[PDB]
Structures are given as C-alpha cells and as structure tokens.
C-alpha cells in the first residue's frame, strides 16, 4: 500500500485508543486551538470593550477575577458581525482590547464540536453500530450554536453572544429575560420539561434498575461486583422492576419493553432540549415570549395585575439597568 | 425565580450551581444512556422497526455493553464498563443535585446568601474603572429590586418617586 | 431641529451621541446601532457621502419623506411577542404586530434545523442499511469482539 | 485584591485531606495479594 492508503487506514483505524477519523482530522486542531486560546485568555487576557463604548470589562484571573466572575469576554459591539481574526488587528494589543480571543475560540469550538458530532457517526459506522447517538448529541450542540452564533446573527453582533464564563452566562440569561421574556416562551418551557424531565427519568431508571439487581454478592462487598463486563445475562430483573413501577402508578403507565423504555429515555430530554435551542434561535429574531401585560381589565378599565405583570416589572428593572451607558435613544431595538 | 435573582443573587450560589450540575447532568445521562442502548442493540429480530425484538422474560442483554464501552472509550476517553455502577450513578447525580439546591434554599430562608464577593466590592468601590460580569449582574439585581418591589410587595406601601429609580442612559 | 450640532455632540461614553466612526473610519450612526452600520437603504443613502454619513447633507438635505420613513421603520421594528403584541418584551398590550421578517426567519430556522436533524438521521441510517447493520449487531458476529483491546 | 487570608489554607486542606484519604485507600488496595 502507498503512503496515502496507509495514512487513511491509520486515520480510520478502529484500534486507536482515541478514534481519529476524517471528522477527527478537523476536530483535533480546531478544539486544540480553541482550548489553548481559551485557557491563556481566561488566565491572562486584558479587559475587553464588549459593548463598543470604550468601557473595558475585565474577564481574566490575573486582572481581578476569580473562577466564578471570570470570563473570556465577547468581541466589541463596534465589530458587530464582522470577521475579526488576529491578522485584521494592527497589533495583538488592539486584538485583545477588542475581544478577538472570543471570536477565535467560539469559531474554532463550533467547528470542532460539529466535527465531534460527525465523528460520533463515523465511529458508530466503523464499529458496526446503529448511527443515532450523534443525533442525541445534536441537542446540546444546537444549543451551543444558538447562544454563540445564531443569537449574535439575529441581533447583529457577537457582543450579544453568550460570554465564556460563569457570571457572564448569568448576565446573558438575565438580559435575555429582559429582552425576550424567555420564561413565558413555550419553547423554553419545553426545554425545562426536557431537563427537569430528563433528571426525573434519570433518577427513576437508575433507581428501578438498582432496585431490581439480582443477588450475586455478599453484604460485605459492593453489589457492583455482581456484574461482570461483557456477561451475556442481564444483571437485573426487568419483570420485577416493571411489576414495581406498574404497581406504583398503574400497569399500563409502565414500560415492559426495555428498548421502548430506553428510546423514551433518549427522546424526552433530546426533544425538549431541541426546543430549548429553537427557542433561543427564534428569539434570535425577536419572536418573543407571551406578553400578557395589562391583559386583565375591570369594568371601568382599571388594570388588574396578574403574576405576568409582576414578571413585567422585574424585566423592566433588568432592561433599564443593563449596559447602562450604551443606549442614547429610548428604544433598545437590538 | 426572578425575585430570587434580584434579591438573593441565587445564580451565584454554589449550592444552586451544584443543583444545576445535577439536573443538567441527569438530563445528559438520561439522553446518552437511552441513545447508547438504542444504538448498540443486538439484531434480535428481522424487523426494521426494532422494538418488537425484545421479550421482558428474556435472559440476555438486549444491547452490547462491550461495543458501547469501546465506542465511548474511543469517543470520549472513558466509558462505563459496569452496568450496576452505571444505573446507580444515574440515581446519584440528579438526587444529589436536588439535595444541594435544597441546602442553598435553606440558607436563603435566613437571607444567608452568596450575594457578594467582598474583594470584588472593595476593589470596585475604590476603582471606578474596574468592571466584571459580577458587578454588571449586581446592577441588574438593583434594577429588579427597585422596579418590582412596590407591586410585588404591596404590604410595604412602597412609593419610589421617579427620580430615585435606578436607570441607565435613555432607557 | 431643536438646534443641536449633531456632528460635534459628545455622548456620555465619549463617543458621538449621534455620529461616530466605524473601525475603518466611515461616519456612522452612534449609540448601540453602531453594530448595524453595514445597513443600506433607499431612505438613508441620499445622506451618504464617500466617507459615510455626510454632515453637510445631514444638516441641509434631509427631506420630510425621509423623516417619515425613519419614524415608520423605527416604530415597526421586527420585535414582538408570540401572541403578536408589538414592541419590546416589556411593552403593554395595544399594538397588534409581529413583523413578517420575524415570522419568516423564525419559521425557516426551525424547519432548517429539523431538516438538518433529518439529514443526520437518514444519512446515518442509509449508511447502516447499505452496510447491513441497521437492525442491530449480529450476536454471533459482533465486530468489536474480533478487534484487539484498546488496552 | 483584599481576599480572605484563610482562603488559601482552606482550599489547600479541602483538597489535600480527602485526596490523601483516597490515595491511602487506593494504594493499600493495590498492595493486597492479587
């Protein structure tokens, strides 16, 4: 075999400790660049003028941040959606002041994670597996796209994309509530049903299987040793678990089919989170949560507040305070 | 929720953060386990719809743990190899998450908040150019409190004249 | 109109309140809309000179139809709620409005997304079926069992 | 920054004590007769 053939055989080899593959060929350098830039920036980057008003925000550890407050800060509002790679700056100092690291990191990362998904398909194919784990992964991936790419496109600036940091994430969430009333949006509500529900069913499944483990051990050892990797026998009694759960609610609310059940386990959180992503991605074009402000009115016409109006008051506090020096005109239109 | 952000800075609370990690991690485990099982199924029937190729009474595993283990080992670096541990872990993560969040709320019962980082505030008070996402979010909180309190807390009879309401430029 | 010199008006941040420069120098509208300076439209272009928004044109040449058009567009921005309450998320009920641009963009993002998902689904499946393991792993011929261990 | 001066020893012991607990248990497990 020629050099290229050998190379292909290696790249796509099923025997590498970590699978490479052709998606991996793109994934590895992009994730490495995103990771390295992210770590260096988070430790040592100078303050970044996120909102383009010459008001630099400090994100790195060395410049006054801890783990909770620190961030790689989104690129300047002055840049908007312009492509700002290192070679567009006159100097690394300019690059840093304007939040170049953010763009380098999120582009390399979005590419790298997309290729991560593809790579999940690829290895499933090499191993003779069914292919749809990558489809489950598409949900968190779509979410990442929503907050790092789509929302900035819709709002016209990477300065409104989610910050790479913990407190920055909370900043993003609060401003989002102010500007879209995301809490009152049914896609976010489906997202909450998705992750609350995912958590619920995670605990439920775990507890049912654990509860019906077949006795294979003594009381002085872990029950885990009762399972051996690659044994052909199932390690728990699904009929017993179904008997239990079916009696807990009623029989036909419970799954007797393991495949059906595990399919449920995959579908609920994945679909819920798909809707979360789509919620962010469509509020990206300002189709917002339900607005029932002043919806109830008495016989004279007095406003009768509901809980929605109280929400509205909170949102107003967020709105009037956020980015306090950035607005010169009365409407915040993006 | 919004009250807890504005008054307690609840998102800053490490017990709530552990809660979030437990719920999001629970969701992740739900998704990834269900999808993994469904994609390492043995062909136990001739149907292209594969649900019928299961019998609750059957003795065999319906999917391949060995293939699953190699796949995740090569994709993510590590993988479950023990099923009992897998399912115990699935119990452990969301249950522990919710318990931690509970501890945090018990603290908020007494206004025992993780509201501030004292070092942050000392620096920012002395240095009008020092800005982080932490100080940004407190400005948001101050907005929430002042703008929501009079209607949200009617028993207090709050009257906040226009001139005292915190507001940035224009808005 | 009230007598402000909009070219020299310094805003609170030190950037122009009405007018500032783009990162490459063109004269552009100030405030947050600095992000949108790539916008081009028939009602704005007559005020545009070779270096961007032209101060003399701004001072002397703005027509009433332009004022009208800017007011109309400003007051019909593509912002609105799912039940079609026009405006920012904090606005009170009164105006029944969500932009067609919002409807079209959101609908087609949703559809494009689920169609990407569908592509992943049917591509993965078509591969698996063509290779012949779309229905599951052959117990007596499980491929991983014929591979060397990773360690 | 005016951080809490006990923060360092707090973090250090928080990490080291239980970590050391685990390392002790692990090593004496390995050394048990295979």
């Amino acid at each position: 075999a020629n050099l290229w053939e050998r190379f292909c055989n290696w790249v796509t080899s099923t025997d590498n400790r970590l699978y490479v593959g052709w998606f991996g060929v793109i994934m590895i350098p992009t994730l490495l660049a995103a990771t390295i830039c992210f770590v260096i920036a988070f430790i040592a980057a100078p303050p970044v003028d996120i909102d383009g008003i010459r008001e630099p925000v400090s994100g790195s550890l060395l410049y006054g941040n801890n783990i909770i407050t620190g961030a790689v800060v989104p690129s300047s509002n002055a840049i908007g959606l312009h492509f700002y790679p290192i070679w567009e700056a006159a100097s690394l100092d300019e690059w840093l002041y304007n939040g170049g690291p953010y763009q380098l990191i999120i582009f390399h990362f979005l590419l790298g994670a997309s290729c991560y998904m593809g790579r999940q398909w690829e290895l499933s194919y090499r191993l003779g597996m069914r292919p749809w784990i990558c489809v489950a992964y598409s949900a968190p991936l779509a979410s990442a796209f929503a907050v790092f790419l789509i929302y900035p496109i819709g709002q016209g600036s990477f300065s409104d994309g989610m910050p790479l940091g913990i407190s920055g994430t909370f900043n993003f969430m609060i401003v989002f509530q102010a500007e879209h009333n995301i809490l009152m949006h049914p896609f976010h509500q489906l997202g909450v049903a998705g992750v609350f529900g995912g958590a619920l069913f995670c605990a439920m499944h775990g507890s049912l299987v654990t509860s019906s483990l077949i006795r294979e051990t003594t009381e002085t050892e872990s029950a885990n040793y009762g399972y051996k990797f690659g044994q052909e026998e199932e390690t728990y009694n699904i009929v017993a678990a179904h008997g239990y759960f079916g009696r807990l609610i009623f029989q036909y609310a419970s799954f007797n089919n393991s495949r059906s059940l595990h399919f449920f386990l995959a579908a609920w959180p994945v679909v819920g989170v798909w809707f979360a992503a789509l919620g962010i991605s469509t509020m990206a074009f300002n189709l917002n949560g339900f607005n029932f402000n002043h919806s109830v009115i008495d016989a004279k016409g007095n406003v009768i507040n509901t809980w929605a109006d109280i929400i509205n008051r909170a949102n107003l506090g967020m709105e009037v305070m956020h980015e306090r020096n950035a607005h010169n005109f009365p409407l915040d239109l993006a | 929720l919004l009250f807890f952000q504005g008054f307690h800075n609840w998102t800053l609370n490490p017990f709530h953060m552990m809660g979030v990690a437990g719920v999001l991690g629970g969701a992740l485990l739900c998704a990834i386990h269900g999808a993994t099982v469904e994609n390492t199924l043995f062909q136990d029937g001739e149907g292209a719809s594969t649900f019928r190729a299961f019998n609750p009474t059957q003795a065999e595993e319906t999917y391949s743990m060995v293939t699953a283990n190699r796949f995740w080992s090569q994709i993510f670096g590590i993988a479950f190899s023990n099923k009992r541990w897998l399912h115990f872990f699935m119990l452990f993560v969301p249950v522990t998450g919710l318990w931690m969040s509970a501890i945090g709320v018990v603290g908020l019962a007494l206004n025992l908040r993780s509201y501030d980082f004292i070092s942050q505030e000392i620096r920012a008070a002395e240095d009008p150019e020092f800005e982080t996402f932490y100080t940004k979010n407190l400005l948001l909180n101050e907005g929430i409190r002042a703008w929501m309190a009079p209607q949200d807390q009617p028993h207090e009879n709050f009257v906040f004249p226009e001139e005292v309401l915190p507001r940035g430029n224009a808005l | 109109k009230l007598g402000a010199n909009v070219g020299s008006a310094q805003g609170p941040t030190g950037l122009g309140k009405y007018l500032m420069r783009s990162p490459t120098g063109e004269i552009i509208f100030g405030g947050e809309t600095m992000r949108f300076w790539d916008f081009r439209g028939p009602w704005l272009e007559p005020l545009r000179g070779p270096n961007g928004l032209d101060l003399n044109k701004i001072k002397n040449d703005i027509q009433p139809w332009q004022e009208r058009r800017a007011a109309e567009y400003m007051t019909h921005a593509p912002l609105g709620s799912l039940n079609s309450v026009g405006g920012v998320a904090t606005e009170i009920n009164s105006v029944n409005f969500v932009s067609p641009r919002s409807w079209l963009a959101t609908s087609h993002f949703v559809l494009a997304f689920f169609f990407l998902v569908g592509h992943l689904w049917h591509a993965g499946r078509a591969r698996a079926a063509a290779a012949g393991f779309e229905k599951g792993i052959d117990r007596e011929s499980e491929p991983v069992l014929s591979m060397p261990s990773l360690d | 920054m005016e951080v809490n001066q006990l923060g360092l020893i707090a973090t250090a012991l928080f990490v080291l004590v239980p970590s050391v607990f685990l390392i002790i248990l692990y090593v004496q497990t390995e050394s048990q007769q295979k």
Binding site: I43, F229 | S73, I78 | - | -
Partner: peptide, 30 residues
Amino acid sequence: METITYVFIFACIIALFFFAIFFREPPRIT
C-alpha cells in the same frame, strides 16, 4: 495566591483527565 490556586486546581484536573484515560484499569471481558 488566588490565581495560583485556581490555575493549580485546574492543572491537577487536566492531569487527572490524562491518567483516567490513558492509565485507566482496562475493561476485561469475562
């Protein structure tokens, strides 16, 4: 000291990733 502490814990975690992956107890079929 704070910064050193944060970066040190992070570094230990990355090293831990390395050992957990390349020096894991190998899964063995029975």
